[PDB]
Amino acid sequence: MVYVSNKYLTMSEMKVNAQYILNYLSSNGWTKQAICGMLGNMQSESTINPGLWQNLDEGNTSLGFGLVQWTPASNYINWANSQGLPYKNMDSELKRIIWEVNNNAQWINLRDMTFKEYIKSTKTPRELAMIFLASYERPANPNQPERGDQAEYWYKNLS
Numbered sequence: 001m002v003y004v005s006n007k008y009l010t011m012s013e014m015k016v017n018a019q020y021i022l023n024y025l026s027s028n029g030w031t032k033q034a035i036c037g038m039l040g041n042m043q044s045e046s047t048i049n050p051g052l053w054q055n056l057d058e059g060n061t062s063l064g065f066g067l068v069q070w071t072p073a074s075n076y077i078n079w080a081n082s083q084g085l086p087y088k089n090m091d092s093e094l095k096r097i098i099w100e101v102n103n104n105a106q107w108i109n110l111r112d113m114t115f116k117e118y119i120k121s122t123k124t125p126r127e128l129a130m131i132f133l134a135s136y137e138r139p140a141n142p143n144q145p146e147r148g149d150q151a152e153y154w155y156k157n158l159s
């Protein structure tokens, strides 16, 4: 059970999606800390909603889409379509992220941590949140310390 829509999720809805992501990525070798660091980012990017377009502007593939706001959305949608995966889909977006770690895509090593190091890390959810922000997401505004608060929130409130 996941929420997938072009709408901002409430805290209760985010919690359903966040637990799902943690279970999925744990089976693929990620630590809870690394997952929560990423979740703290996804909350700011999309309210952890695989269906969400930047500005709620549905169909604008030049802008952000999905959990992490792939920008341009075509960076992800092109891949899903080429891979025969439905683009508007939780698992499809998690598969992209796994694909990125395996092929060293998306990540720029600005904090002397590689993507492969990140996913195995037991640094705090706040620190990993800030690393994922700087290395993977890289939005026009880099000052979003709330992503670390959010990471810790998910670390505390999920299993």
Ligand SMILES: CC(=O)N[C@@H]1[C@@H](O)[C@H](O[C@@H]2O[C@H](CO)[C@@H](O[C@@H]3O[C@H](CO)[C@@H](O)[C@H](O)[C@H]3NC(C)=O)[C@H](O)[C@H]2NC(C)=O)[C@@H](CO)O[C@H]1O
Binding pocket: 045, 054, 064, 068, 069, 070, 071, 072, 075, 106, 136, 137, 138, 139, 140, 141
């Ligand atoms: C208005 C705004 O902030 N929009 C946000 C997007 O900027 C942000 O997506 C990220 O955008 C940056 C800058 O375009 C991307 O980094 C660039 O990536 C290319 C590789 O294709 C590289 O050549 C550049 O060096 C690099 N620039 C910088 C400054 O790092 C980055 O890949 C985008 N991130 C993702 C996940 O696609 C998204 C996500 O934070 O949010 C929009 O709101």
